[PDB]
Amino acid sequence: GKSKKWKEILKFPHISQCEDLRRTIDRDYCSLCDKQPIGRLLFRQFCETRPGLECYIQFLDSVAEYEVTPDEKLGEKGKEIMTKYLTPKSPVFIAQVGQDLVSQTEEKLLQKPCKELFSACAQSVHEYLRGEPFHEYLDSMFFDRFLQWKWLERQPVTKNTFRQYRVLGKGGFGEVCACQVRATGKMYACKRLEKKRIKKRKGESMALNEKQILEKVNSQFVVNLAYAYETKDALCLVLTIMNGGDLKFHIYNMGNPGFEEERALFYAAEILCGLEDLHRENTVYRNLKPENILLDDYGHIRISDLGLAVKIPEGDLIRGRVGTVGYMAPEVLNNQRYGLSPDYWGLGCLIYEMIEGQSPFRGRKEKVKREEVDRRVLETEEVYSHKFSEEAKSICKMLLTKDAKQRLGCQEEGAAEVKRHPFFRNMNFKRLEAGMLDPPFVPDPRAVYCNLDHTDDDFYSKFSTGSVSIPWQNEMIETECFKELNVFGPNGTLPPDLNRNHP
Numbered sequence: 001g002k003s004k005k006w007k008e009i010l011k012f013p014h015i016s017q018c019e020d021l022r023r024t025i026d027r028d029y030c031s032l033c034d035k036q037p038i039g040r041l042l043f044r045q046f047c048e049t050r051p052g053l054e055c056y057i058q059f060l061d062s063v064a065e066y067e068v069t070p071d072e073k074l075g076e077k078g079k080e081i082m083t084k085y086l087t088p089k090s091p092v093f094i095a096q097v098g099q100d101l102v103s104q105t106e107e108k109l110l111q112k113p114c115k116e117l118f119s120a121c122a123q124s125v126h127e128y129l130r131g132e133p134f135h136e137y138l139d140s141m142f143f144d145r146f147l148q149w150k151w152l153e154r155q156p157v158t159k160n161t162f163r164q165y166r167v168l169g170k171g172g173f174g175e176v177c178a179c180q181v182r183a184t185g186k187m188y189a190c191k192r193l194e195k196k197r198i199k200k201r202k203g204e205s206m207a208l209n210e211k212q213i214l215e216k217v218n219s220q221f222v223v224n225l226a227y228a229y230e231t232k233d234a235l236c237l238v239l240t241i242m243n244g245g246d247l248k249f250h251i252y253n254m255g256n257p258g259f260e261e262e263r264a265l266f267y268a269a270e271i272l273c274g275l276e277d278l279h280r281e282n283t284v285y286r287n288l289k290p291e292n293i294l295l296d297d298y299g300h301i302r303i304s305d306l307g308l309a310v311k312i313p314e315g316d317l318i319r320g321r322v323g324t325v326g327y328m329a330p331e332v333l334n335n336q337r338y339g340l341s342p343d344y345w346g347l348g349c350l351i352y353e354m355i356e357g358q359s360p361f362r363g364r365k366e367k368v369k370r371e372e373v374d375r376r377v378l379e380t381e382e383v384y385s386h387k388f389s390e391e392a393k394s395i396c397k398m399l400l401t402k403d404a405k406q407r408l409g410c411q412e413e414g415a416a417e418v419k420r421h422p423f424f425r426n427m428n429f430k431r432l433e434a435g436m437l438d439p440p441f442v443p444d445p446r447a448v449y450c451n452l453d454h455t456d457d458d459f460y461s462k463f464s465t466g467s468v469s470i471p472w473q474n475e476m477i478e479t480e481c482f483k484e485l486n487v488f489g490p491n492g493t494l495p496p497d498l499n500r501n502h503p
């Protein structure tokens with residue numbers, strides 16, 4: 001699906017074009033060698049040349065595999081890492097973790113193993129690469145190549161960059177599309193926001209608020225922002241495409257209604273990880289309802305529709321009676337100053353509704369007024385059935401605690417208090433965050449579930465910021481544009497584009 005001549009659109013600039021990039025990029029090791037996908041790869045590729053550095057990359061890979069190994073096979077995997085990397089006689093031995101560190105970790109294996117047994121060594125290893133190897137990579141052809149990729153990353157994005165397809169739904173301020181990048185062929189989802197409608201309503205602040213929240217979140221379980229460009233007559237937001245339908249459809253149309261507890265467990269775990277990633281940016285979602293939880297092609301879920309989401313200043317609370325009837329926490333209904341607590345209430349609503357096949361305060365076959373629904377939320381205790389295990393009852397009623405001060409996860413411990421709950425006792429969040437747990441339902445690939453003012457000029461300039469860095473680099477990797485273009489000279493020589501001699 002890559003546009004003919006995509007190798008020209010993504011043609012590397014000559015390294016002489018990136019001098020202004022060199023003198024402005026902050027040389028942070030974590031960002032340049034880990035956070036940014038292409039930087040991580042290029043730094044890993046730099047270590048692939050040195051024999052002394054090669055060993056340290058293989059070890060970190062094996063530690064990553066140890067973290068997600070089943071508990072019954074930790075001692076097995078653990079011993080393998082010792083007799084390969086931590087033995088002084090090995091051909092590929094880690095020398096920078098002092099002998100006074102190898103002898104320590106050799107003891108944790110003399111007892112029941114923990115999945116973080118190698119965290120001390122991995123951090124020691126990183127502190128070594130953080131110094132001499134990193135600064136040598138900065139003066140290497142691979143960091144010059146990184147700059148070339150950054151140069152491309154910053155190129156202007158317009159409509160020309162994309163190839164609009166069918167309308168994949170609509171909302172309250174525009175429609176959705178099936179974006180495709182012509183150069184890479186990766187599918188996306190637009191969120192068109194017609195300029196006429198946003199100016200008339202005076203909601204420019206909410207448009208940028210959403211785009212900036214979507215841009216700062218980098219979760220596997222929340223819709224991510226890849227591009228933000230402006231078209232004549234609209235402001236677009238290019239988001240993760242989700243083709244598996246929403247969770248409301250699967251609860252009520254595919255369901256009993258409702259799911260088996262173990263299946264609801266899986267979706268709850270991923271929704272909780274999404275909420276945790278949002279809360280890292282002290283951002284409250286406030287729109288948690290089954291139809292906003294979408295499924296992708298693999299069966300995993302992401303939180304969508306962040307239009308009612310707000311970034312809370314650390315140490316401050318906010319007001320806002322917003323959301324959907326039936327899914328508003330008590331502190332929200334009372335128009336009080338709250339923080340992240342509404343989201344753990346919503347989680348309770350979602351777990352309950354997934355298991356029971358109806359909302360905890362409104363019967364599926366009940367005809368009630370908005371006001372009676374609200375009274376129940378403030379006054380009535382929800383009742384449970386035999387569909388809920390004792391653990392499921394617990395987490396639900398602790399998340400559905402009316403008082404936001406005693407509500408689960410609303411303490412200073414945050415979402416960690418929720419992952420520790422006996423309801424997730426059989427859930428390994430390390431393996432879930434890594435994508436190694438098979439979803440309970442896989443959508444079929446063929447399935448189909450369904451004016452001239454100048455002050456406005458400044459608002460487009462702050463919004464239409466173009467490509468988002470981490471998603472863009474991931475796009476290049478997924479589509480194998482990186483593997484194909486990231487070619488150097490034969491036998492570790494400089495290719496023409498990285499040789500300052502002849503442009």
Ligand SMILES: Cc1[nH]c(/C=C2\C(=O)N=C3CC=C(C(=O)N[C@H](C)c4ccccc4)C=C32)c(C)c1C(=O)NC[C@@H](O)C1CCOCC1
Pocket residue numbers: 168169170171172173174175176189191192223239240241242243244245246294304305306307445446447448449450
């Ligand atoms: C293709 C598709 N897109 C979407 C919507 C989204 C998606 O993917 N990612 C985001 C991110 C963020 C949002 C979001 O904020 N919306 C809010 C309310 C909004 C507010 C105001 C204006 C606009 C929107 C929505 C979406 C969905 C739910 C589906 C689906 O499941 N189709 C089933 C089946 O028909 C496909 C079709 C194609 O091929 C066969 C399988």
